[PDB]
A paper describes a structure:
Here we present a fluorescent genetically encoded biosensor, Hypocrates, for the visualization of (pseudo)hypohalous acids and their derivatives. Hypocrates consists of a circularly permuted yellow fluorescent protein integrated into the structure of the transcription repressor NemR from Escherichia coli. Wild-type NemR contains several redox-active Cys residues and is sensitive to reactive chlorine species, including HOCl and chloramines, as well as to some electrophiles. Therefore, to develop a biosensor specific for HOCl, we use NemR with only a single cysteine, Cys106 (NemRC106).
The orthorhombic crystals (C2221, a = 90.23, b = 95.44, c = 106.25, α = β = γ = 90°) contain one molecule of the biosensor per asymmetric unit and diffract to a resolution of 2.2 Å. HypocratesCS consists of a NemRC106S-based sensor domain (green) and a cpYFP domain (yellow) that contains the p-hydroxybenzylidene-imidazolidinone chromophore (orange), designated as “CR2” in the PDB. As such, the insertion of cpYFP had only a minor structural effect on the overall structure of the NemR-sensor domain. The chromophore is in cis-configuration and consists of an imidazolinone ring connected to a planar 4-hydroxybenzyl ring. The 4-hydroxybenzyl ring of the chromophore is stabilized by π-π stacking interaction with the phenyl-ring of Phe164, which has an off-centered parallel orientation to the 4-hydroxybenzyl ring. Asn95 is located on the connecting loop between the α4 helix of the NemR-sensor domain and the N-terminus of the cpYFP domain. Further inspection of the structure showed that non-covalent interface interactions between cpYFP β-barrel and the NemR-sensor domain are relatively limited.
Numbering used by the authors: 8 to 40, 44 to 192, 208 to 271, 275 to 448
The structure:
Amino acid sequence: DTREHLLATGEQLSLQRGFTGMGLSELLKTAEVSFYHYFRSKEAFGVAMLERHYAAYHQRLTELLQSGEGNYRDRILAYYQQTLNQFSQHGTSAGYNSDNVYIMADKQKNGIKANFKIRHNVEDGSVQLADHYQQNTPIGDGPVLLPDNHYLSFQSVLSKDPNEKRDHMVLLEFVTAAGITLGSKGEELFTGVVPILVELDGDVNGHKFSVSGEGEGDATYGKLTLKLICTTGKLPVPWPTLVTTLLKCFARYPDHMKQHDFFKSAMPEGYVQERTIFFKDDGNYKTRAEVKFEGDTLVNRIELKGIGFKEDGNILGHKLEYNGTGSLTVKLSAEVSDLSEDMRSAMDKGARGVIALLSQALENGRENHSLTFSGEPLQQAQVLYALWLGANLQAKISRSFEPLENALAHVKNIIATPAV
């Protein structure tokens, strides 16, 4: 559909450029399409793009708050929870959901396999797809837990050390297993905070490079903190393309799922993690990593080979955004100022449809004893919206999980489970 394609394109463009900065020629270029054929003006296009965006988000909020997992309180917490991820985002869902990687047993190999799509943002507004095909196999001979089908929820943010001169990446991940409704000796090595060492030897199209990182992971909270330095000069590829290559052992497996943690069970001997990553319309990475304990440190030692890249493509030409975009509602909330009145009204109605959804959830949860809170639904809905808006925004400025963690902790406190 031509009209949908333009609106979809213009949303991504605004997600990155903003609306007032999105030019019409740049929109038809990236969309490969004219224009007044389908829209009266850029202003009318913007109203339509806004109404389309909020219609999809109201529907996403509706099925979460009225039909999601758990009770009304759990759904309200998830309304915050699904916004922590700032990596691999696109389209109507960008800034609204974590990235779920489906884990599956590979009994033939006594390990696990996965396949998933990573989406990088090209600075021109198009999206670089990266198809991951992954196999993991124990290094040791000891028995390993072979899991039933589940997934790992990945939430990541990339930042920079302001004192670091070298080409480098700061990477923070929150990773949680889920998908099963109702351990091992290796599990015991992860009860506390564990030093990490990462080493990558890379060769992409003949450009060699070495990446060396150090950090710590906290599996009880599914937390991973790394700072990775390119030790041979400029990284000849965009840092976002190495994120998945540069520790699923640090995932938080909830109590009822401990029998399905293959990654901790293979420890301390460890496991081999192999991938092919197919970059659409470009080349591919093949990676081989040993993840294992060396003394008290968890080591991820990696070799990487890339063949078939375009020297002027998105990867070798460094055309990839380093940061996530976040959501459009926050990106454009930021933009009211120069907007037309018809589009000022469009955000107003979009933000109010969200608040109304939060209010119904608070009211319904009261009535069915999912939750108690001091205040009334509509006013409390507005406080929750504002907190959600400020926290996401401040999570983007600081490139950190802290604001949403603190905000979510606040929400658990004020939207309480009723006394027994």
